[PDB]
Amino acid sequence: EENVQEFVLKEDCELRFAAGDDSDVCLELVKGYAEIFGTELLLNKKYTFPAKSRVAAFTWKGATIELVGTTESAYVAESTPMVIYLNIHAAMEEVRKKREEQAKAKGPRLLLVGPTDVGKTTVSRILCNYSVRQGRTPIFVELDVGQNSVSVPGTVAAVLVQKTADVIDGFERNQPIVFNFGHTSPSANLSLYEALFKEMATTLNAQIQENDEAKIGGMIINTCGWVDGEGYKCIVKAASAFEVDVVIVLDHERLYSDLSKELPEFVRLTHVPKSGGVEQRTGQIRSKMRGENVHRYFYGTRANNLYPFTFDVSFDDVTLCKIGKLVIMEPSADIKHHLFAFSRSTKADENVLKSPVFGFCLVTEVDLEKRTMSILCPQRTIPSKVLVFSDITHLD
Ligand SMILES: Nc1ncnc2c1ncn2[C@@H]1O[C@H](COP(=O)(O)OP(=O)(O)NP(=O)(O)O)[C@@H](O)[C@H]1O
Ligand SMILES: [Mg+2]
């Protein structure tokens, strides 16, 4: 509402706060310098964070910050691993220059691993932002099909980062490369998951041959939290497929010891602690968040609204298929509420499995007698006649 809280942050402190369950909180930096997960704050700009937001504003040299509205929590932390996360960037940049002097230059590729809720996504964000602030253009690769910060759930995705994340909305989602996995966990089909990220690595390697800035920018790769059992071998295959030269393990000493013995000796492995400000989720909140991600795909944000179309499509004008080999689907009541991917492949081939997607639509109604379905779509006509099933559902 109207009530105010003021905070003085010494050097190397962060204001950690969570917005209430019900209302916005607005942050304003009123003296000094501060950043939120790597993005510089502008002085006296009012940043409106929505309900449930969890945020840290960090300062290297000292800051004073005002928060307007109700907070569930808000305190200043005097100890962070931020210098750790900064020295990782410094080290990547050092590799970049040496490899520039050695010459086109191939930038460092970094894999972030660790269990759930250790601040992995936040750390990728910081590292991407610090690369941009250095003048570089890194590729952010997102292998977490549950909580994906680039596309919808059930995807493996990658974007070229050319600007710092917006403090509220995250990175711009401009022309991502997107593969439809179709499930919220790799365990649903681990062999397909591994095939998809291998196809992702192969595609990116050939893409960067046509863009030197992207090539030297390198890659920051976020993984999911499945580190045990089969998840472990999956980490090793990802390290190999993407030819990473740095693995950052967050808050897992056994995983660190195991990887140190297994990875090629040329790979640098760094164990770092999680921040004390990382919030543990539950399954319910994770589900809630997947739904909000899908909504954002179609409708956008408060800052940048997207205006999707709803229209009807004849069963005759599209072919529905499902992976798991390809199988063709006869449109039924059960496709209702499901996301489908518009495949870049021209027919319902073997090639559907290997192909990135144009984008997604949501099947909102199924008229079996009229033989038409209603879809929510980011564009006015379908970009492809090959629609690939995702097990992710969304009530809108
Ligand atoms: N230093 C911090 N202070 C306050 N909040 C933070 C901090 N670091 C992370 N968070 C918040 O904690 C939540 C979880 O962080 P996140 O970086 O998604 O962890 P994660 O390891 O990627 N989770 P998952 O991928 O679901 O296993 C997010 O809302 C962040 O904004
Ligand atoms: Mg994450």
UniProtKB/Swiss-Prot annotation:
Stored Pfam families: Clp1, CLP1_N, CLP1_P
**UniProt-listed InterPro entries:** Clp1, Clp1/Grc3, Clp1_C, Clp1_C_sf, Clp1_N, Clp1_N_sf, CLP1_P, P-loop_NTPase
GO molecular function annotations of the record: ATP binding; ATP-dependent polyribonucleotide 5'-hydroxyl-kinase activity; polynucleotide 5'-hydroxyl-kinase activity
Q: Which Gene3D superfamilies match?
A: Clp1, DNA binding domain, P-loop containing nucleotide triphosphate hydrolases, Pre-mRNA cleavage complex subunit Clp1, C-terminal domain
What is the protein's known function? Required for endonucleolytic cleavage during polyadenylation-dependent pre-mRNA 3'-end formation.
Q: What is this protein called?
A: Protein clpf-1
| Native source organism of the sequence | Caenorhabditis elegans
Q: Which family does it belong to?
A: Belongs to the Clp1 family. Clp1 subfamily.
Where in the cell?
A: Nucleus
Q: GO cellular component terms?
A: mRNA cleavage factor complex; nucleus
Its GO biological process annotations read: mRNA 3'-end processing; tRNA splicing, via endonucleolytic cleavage and ligation
